[PDB]
Design a protein around this nucleic acid. Structure first.
Ligand SMILES: [Mg+2]
Ligand SMILES: [Mg+2]
Ligand SMILES: [Mg+2]
Ligand SMILES: [Mg+2]
Length: 688
DNA sequence: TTCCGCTTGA
């Protein structure tokens, strides 16, 4: 009848689509992109190597015409499709329905060059009605989307291949700089600077255990603990009252109790009774966690299962290829009605009708009205039991089930009832001899666990906090009730520097800033580690001195290229290209040469990217760029770190026999993190 | 020397 060729991007869809379609339909896969810009000069065809832009791959002097070549990894895949194209009646371009997927269909047109009719439709749901809906109602190739994808491609190409040579002439060779990797490095570097410029401050208070069984034996719990809050109408300072330099923020508003000060208030207080001023309770209701997307999956697998980004997505790949979970590269949290009414079934069989939500639970996001797959959840209409997945997946690599259980529990919890409870706020007054003291304590009750019986989020390893199912019981006291002082213990504390970035906390920061995509979060963690900018200290992402010099040079003379707002603002200028108003050539002309467009501080206002690199390969001294300013010594001589041929080395200008300037230097290895390089540690390795 | 995004086997 009619041999029709359907091309998707995933082989898992191929065998799946070939079942709902049947005979006559040939379903093959491209495995992503087939064409890309030449990665190096060796990939440029011979007739273009002499052209003065073969290093870029884009003809920036002729309306930004790229040089698309077949990527050698996808070379054999192209030959298979060209042969299948010779013996078919029509060609169906059924790639994804996003910006990158639409360009692949256009790349398939330019590469295959068919003479048969071509239809462009998108398959979201994999069902017989959804297959018959998009196929019977085709569509045209969105050229505005392809021009937007090209504009994103050429942008990242001009960014990376023009700014990286700046690092080669100012820092070290073979270094890289990108719209994503340089900003991710800039985040980890900025956090380390916060820990380096952090001055701790000590503060004290009183921890008092109390008793209420005297005035009310029928009380539960009979005892509880409280802390000191106010002394003589003046707040007791805690962590939130000190800034990054140890000074006070509230100014003349709080007290700073010391050891002798607190032990005196605890001394002249025991033996007396405390009076309950107020005890106001308040109800609350926690909504269930949304289903797993790519970011939240990597976060929870890092906090609970201690998996890395590559370890998580490698397991999710095998789980998807074997038909256990859906597509793991997604930015959506939506569920199909088959998955909703199935998670409500498994939850009811496991926790009864008491914990199942009485209302349909759906958690939607945004992108472009209807341009945005679904969440990561167990595939099929009937969820495979985690017991059967535990059997079918044996071997020492049991991680395939431990990650599957998380997806099976998280999805079930999304369709369960809320968590009902109450929280207290006790204000306890007293008299410490001649001064008025105020004690305060708070607790949280979990009357109805709900979805917390199936899945509970894990706290961060470094940030630290309270679990969402942790209870803090307190007795119900009456205003005016008298409490006995069981124990008084003045404890001392100190403010701690900001926490390092984990692989989970960094991905959470990238997704919130709009940087990187679900299919790139793992590659970002790998890239900044392979380029030599970030290394792991157990679970913390620690920067390097090369990362300080690269980020420092970038944030000085290429400030907008490393701004967190850049990718978000570039995405807004890209969404207009995909809808009209602006053109592909006009926007690239402003970004590379200059124009009236963008935010006030954008690159088009600064004279384009070409002129921005020209004034930096001319009016920049690498000796000042390789100067990571640390601090001054006891004599006021500045100490800075320089990055050389041998490696990162410490340096300051000291006096010698004839005086100054004698550069005294030392060596630095990655065993001393930047926050651990104080003036004492610096003076140690300076001597010997 | 170098980019970001798409997706699997070399
Ligand atoms: Mg795709
Ligand atoms: Mg305390
Ligand atoms: Mg209560
Ligand atoms: Mg615009």
């Amino acid at each position: 009848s009619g041999r029709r060729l359907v091309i998707v991007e995933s082989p898992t869809k191929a065998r799946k689509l070939a079942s709902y379609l049947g005979s006559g339909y040939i379903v093959e896969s491209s495995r992503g992109h087939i064409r890309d810009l030449p990665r190096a000069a060796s990939d440029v065809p011979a007739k273009y190597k002499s052209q003065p832009w073969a290093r870029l791959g884009v003809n920036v002097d002729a309306d930004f015409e790229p040089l698309y070549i077949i990527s050698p990894e996808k070379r054999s895949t192209v030959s298979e499709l060209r042969g299948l194209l010779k013996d078919v009646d029509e060609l169906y371009l059924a790639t994804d329905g996003d910006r990158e997927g639409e360009a692949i269909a256009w790349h398939l047109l330019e590469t295959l060059k068919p003479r048969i009719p071509v239809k462009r439709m998108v398959f979201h749901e994999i069902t017989e009605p959804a297959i018959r809906a998009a196929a019977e109602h085709p569509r045209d190739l969105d050229i505005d989307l392809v021009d937007a994808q090209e504009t994103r491609r050429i942008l990242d190409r001009l960014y990376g291949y023009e700014v990286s040579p700046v690092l080669w002439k100012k820092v070290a060779p073979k270094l890289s700089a990108g719209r994503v990797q340089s900003v991710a490095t800039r985040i980890i570097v900025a956090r380390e600077r916060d820990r380096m410029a952090f001055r701790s401050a000590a503060y004290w208070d009183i921890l008092a255990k109390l008793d209420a069984s005297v005035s009310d034996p029928d009380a539960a719990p009979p005892t509880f603990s409280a802390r000191l809050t106010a002394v003589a109408g003046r707040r007791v300072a805690t962590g939130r009252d000190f800034d990054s330099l140890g000074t006070l923020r509230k100014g003349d508003e709080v007290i700073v109790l010391d050891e002798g000060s607190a032990t005196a208030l605890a001394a002249g207080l025991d033996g007396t009774q405390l009076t309950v001023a107020s005890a106001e309770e308040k109800p609350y209701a926690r909504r269930p966690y949304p289903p797993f997307m790519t970011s939240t999956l990597q976060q929870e697998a890092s906090r609970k299962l201690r998996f890395s980004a590559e370890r998580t997505m490698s397991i999710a790949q095998r789980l998807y290829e074997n038909g256990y979970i859906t597509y793991m590269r997604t930015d959506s949290t939506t569920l199909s009605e088959s998955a909703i009414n199935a998670a409500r079934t498994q939850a009811r069989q496991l926790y009864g009708d008491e914990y199942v939500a009485p209302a349909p639970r759906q958690y939607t996001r945004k992108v472009k009205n209807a341009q945005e797959h679904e969440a990561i959840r167990p595939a099929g209409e009937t969820f495979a039991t985690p017991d059967a997945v535990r059997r079918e997946l044996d071997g020492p690599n049991i991680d395939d089930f431990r990650l599957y259980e998380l997806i099976w529990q998280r999805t079930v919890a999304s369709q369960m009832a809320d968590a009902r409870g109450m929280t207290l706020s006790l204000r306890i007054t007293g008299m410490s001899g001649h001064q008025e003291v105020v004690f305060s304590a708070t607790g949280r009750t979990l009357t109805f666990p709900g979805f917390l019986k199936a899945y509970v989020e894990t706290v961060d390893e470094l940030v630290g906090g309270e679990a969402d199912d942790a209870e803090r019981r307190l007795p119900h006291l009456t205003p005016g009730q008298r409490l006995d002082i069981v124990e008084l213990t003045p404890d001392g504390h100190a403010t701690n520097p900001p926490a390092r970035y984990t692989e989970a906390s960094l991905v959470k920061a990238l997704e919130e800033l709009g940087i990187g995509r679900p299919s790139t979060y793992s590659s970002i963690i790998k890239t900044i580690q392979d380029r030599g900018y970030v290394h792991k200290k157990g679970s913390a992402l620690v920067p390097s001195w090369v990362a300080f010099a690269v980020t420092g040079l970038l944030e000085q003379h290429f400030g907008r290229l490393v701004d967190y707002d850049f990718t978000a603002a570039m995405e807004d200028e890209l969404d207009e290209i995909a809808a009209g108003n602006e053109r592909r050539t006009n926007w690239l002309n402003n970004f590379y040469f200059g124009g009236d467009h963008g935010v006030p501080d954008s690159v088009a206002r600064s004279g384009g990217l070409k002129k921005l690199v020209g004034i930096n390969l001319e009016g920049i001294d690498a000796r000042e760029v390789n100067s990571i300013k640390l601090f001054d010594d006891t004599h006021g001589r500045p100490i800075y770190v320089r990055v050389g041929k041998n490696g990162p080395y410490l340096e300051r200008l000291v006096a010698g026999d004839t005086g100054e300037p004698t550069p005294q230097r030392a060596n630095l290895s990655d065993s001393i993190t930047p926050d651990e390089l104080t003036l004492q540690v610096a003076e140690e390795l300076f001597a010997t």
